[PDB]
Amino acid sequence: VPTPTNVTIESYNMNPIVYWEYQIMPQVPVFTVEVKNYGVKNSEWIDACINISHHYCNISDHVGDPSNSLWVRVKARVGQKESAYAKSEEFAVCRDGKIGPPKLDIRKEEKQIMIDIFHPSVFVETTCYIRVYNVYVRMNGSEIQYKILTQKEDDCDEIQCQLAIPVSSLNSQYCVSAEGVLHVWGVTTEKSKEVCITIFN
Amino acid sequence: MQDPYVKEAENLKKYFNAGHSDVADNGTLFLGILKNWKEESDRKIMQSQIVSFYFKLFKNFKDDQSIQKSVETIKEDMNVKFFNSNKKKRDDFEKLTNYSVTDLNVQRKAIDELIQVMAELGANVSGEFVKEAENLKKYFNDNGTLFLGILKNWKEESDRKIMQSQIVSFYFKLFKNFKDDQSIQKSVETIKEDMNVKFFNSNKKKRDDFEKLTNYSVTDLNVQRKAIHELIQVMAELSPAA
Ligand SMILES: [Cl-]
Numbered sequence: 001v002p003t004p005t006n007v008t009i010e011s012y013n014m015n016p017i018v019y020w021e022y023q024i025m026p027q028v029p030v031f032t033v034e035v036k037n038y039g040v041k042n043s044e045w046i047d048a049c050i051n052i053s054h055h056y057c058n059i060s061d062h063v064g065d066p067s068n069s070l071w072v073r074v075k076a077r078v079g080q081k082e083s084a085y086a087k088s089e090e091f092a093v094c095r096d097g098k099i100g101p102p103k104l105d106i107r108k109e110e111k112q113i114m115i116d117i118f119h120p121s122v123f124v125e126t127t128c129y130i131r132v133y134n135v136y137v138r139m140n141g142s143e144i145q146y147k148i149l150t151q152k153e154d155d156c157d158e159i160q161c162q163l164a165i166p167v168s169s170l171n172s173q174y175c176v177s178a179e180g181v182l183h184v185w186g187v188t189t190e191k192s193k194e195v196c197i198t199i200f201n
Numbered sequence: 202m203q204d205p206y207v208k209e210a211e212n213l214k215k216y217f218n219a220g221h222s223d224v225a226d227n228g229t230l231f232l233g234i235l236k237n238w239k240e241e242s243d244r245k246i247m248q249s250q251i252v253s254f255y256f257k258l259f260k261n262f263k264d265d266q267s268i269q270k271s272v273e274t275i276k277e278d279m280n281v282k283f284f285n286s287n288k289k290k291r292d293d294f295e296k297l298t299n300y301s302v303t304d305l306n307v308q309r310k311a312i313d314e315l316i317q318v319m320a321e322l323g324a325n326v327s328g329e330f331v332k333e334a335e336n337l338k339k340y341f342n343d344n345g346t347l348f349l350g351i352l353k354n355w356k357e358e359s360d361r362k363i364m365q366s367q368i369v370s371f372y373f374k375l376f377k378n379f380k381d382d383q384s385i386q387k388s389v390e391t392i393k394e395d396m397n398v399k400f401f402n403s404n405k406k407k408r409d410d411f412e413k414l415t416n417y418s419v420t421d422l423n424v425q426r427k428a429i430h431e432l433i434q435v436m437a438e439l440s441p442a443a
Contacts, residue, residue, distance in 0.1 A: 036225050038430070039233065043226040067434060068232075072223040090220045112405045125236075128438055134203075151443055186203035 001029065001083040006195055009059075009088055011096065013122045018048070018057045018072050020086060028042040029076045034085075060121045066093040066128040067184060070165055074149045092180060094128035099189040101176055108167075113143030113174055113197060117148070117161040120180065124159060125201065130180035130189070138194075139171040151152040172199050206278040209271035210433045216268050219430040230417060230427045231435050233409045238270065241363050241442050242362050246400075248310060249366035250414040251435060252283055253283060253298045258419050274431070282439040283363075283435040290360060298348065310347040311375060312337045312381040315392070318372075321352045322365060324399040337379045358371045359441070369400050 004020040011017070012072050018033055030093040034045035049057040059072065072088040103118040117133055118124075148163055150156040157165070165174065179191040214220050231251050236245050259272050284291045300307055315334050319326050348368050355361050376393045379385060401408040417424050 036222050038225045041228065043223075064368045068431070069225075071225065087222070089224075111212050127434060181202055184434065185207060 001025070001076045001160050002041055003077050003083045004031065004072055004076055004086040005075055007072065007086045007088045008093045009072060009096070011093050013067060013100050013120070014060070014063070014097060016059050016063060016093060016097065018059055018074070018088065018093070020055055020074050022055060022076060022100060025078075028053055029078060031055070031076050033059070034073050034200055035059055035062040037062065037064050037071075037072045037087055039064070041044065045139060048072075051077070063093055064096075065126045067095075067126050068092060094126075095185045095187060096188075097130045098187075099180070099182070101190040101192040102130075102180055104176060104178060104192050104195050105171060105175070106176060106195055108197055111167055113165045113167060114200075115163045115176055117163065117178055119158075129183055131183040131186075132181045133178050134181065134188075135163060136167060136191075138175045139169075140173060142171070150180060170201055172201060174198075174199065204278075204306075205313065206385055206436060207433060208228075208364075209274045209304065210436070212271045213275070213429050215411050216265070217426050217429045219426045224426050226423075226428045227345060227429065229426075230424065231431050234414060235438055237406070237410060238372060239442070241359060243357050243364040244388045244442065247410060247414060248439060249294075249409055250411070253294075253348070253426065254278060254417065254419055255279070255316065255435075256295075256298065261419075275436075276314065279434065279439065282436065290363075291352070292366065293364060297348075297364060297371070300371055302371060302378060303404040305341075307347065308375060309341045309363065310343070312341045314346060314348050315372075318352075318368060319396070319399070320434070321349070322369075322396075322399055324395070327395070330395050333388040333391040337385055337392075339383045340388075351374070365400070369396065370411075372396060373412075373415065 002023055004022050007018065007020045009016055009018050020031075022029060022031075028057060031052040032050050033047050033048040036045045046062060048059050048062055050111050062201060064071065069092045075085045076083040083200055099122060100120050102120055104118040105118070107114050114136055115135070117135075117141040119130060123129065132150065137144050137146065137148045144167070146163060148155060148161050150161060167174070173196060175194045175196040177192050177194040180189040181187075183191070228417070234247055235244070236250075240245055255274070258274060262268065263272055280291060281284055284294070302308065312334075315337070316326065320329070326399065351364055352361070352368075355364060373393070376389050379389050397408055401411065419425060419428070
């Protein structure tokens, strides 16, 4: 049989799925998907899905540490005739996938606004964690950006990070959004929709 | 926002074909071992062997055409992360990694300083230990030391562990090469075990991780490919813990 083509791996919120395409044949082909993780005991590929006729396979159950690389291969079959394997490029969930946004809450005090940044739900001992949050603030018609370092700071824990912003210049509306930056490859999470608060002068 | 050394390590991966699935075969060289150790002094003795292994590997390829810039960039980032850009710390470490355990004068100096070295490791040696060491000083028979002057240069504990890791591994190699030598075979065995007891603080797991690290040949192509595949993750954990 011909070889599967365009083998691709996509991940949103650490849920990797493998996809491929196949040409029309005079009969209905079936496929088998195999996964190999970096740090394997010997030199073995593990079966993810066996003999399916659709063109995708969720491999979430075969991810070790999100920072570690993995490879996938797919072959087609016709009764007794199997094709050659089509192979994926090296994939690491932390480097190649995308993570959803953090959730933000704002409240006001006398001369400052307090912002609570809750880590994206997927994160609540791997090197795949958020190292810094880039916080974008708009106050009336001005804009400023702040950075929170999650490790060198008492401000952050396993559930959230906190930030205090000073109120000034007769500004009455403060709008805030944030995105996280992952350790190791510096990949960014999605940016949160902006939340606003009104200060009465 | 990505650290500049990352793109250069991805260039080395391409050069060595370390993005191929064959590289996965047979466990890990460095990553799993580093996972096991969380206190900073234990991390520094393991990291010290990992860094010298990468430095020996890069010396074999420093000039290769399309990767000369990449290697230069990565060595300089290791300098910043592991040596805190301290040129004297980096120089003392290189001196220690380059001593030949087969040069008879080097072996003499090393056997001469042994008692003082254990002192520097924080050990209170037994009367027994002292006699076995005089056997060796006899067998093997300058205004420069091998190890004592370097050890006097560093007082912070993490800097000390970086250097002590390279001294303990030199001795363990010297002992291996004389393990079954008639005259001094019982001396060698006696010293060898009190050094292990003290440095590894009676932790067999720590001892074993250390011998694993110490017995990889950076010469085999497959080991070299795995080392290059693990580089980016190893660099991400080289800085001081918190
Ligand atoms: Cl320093």
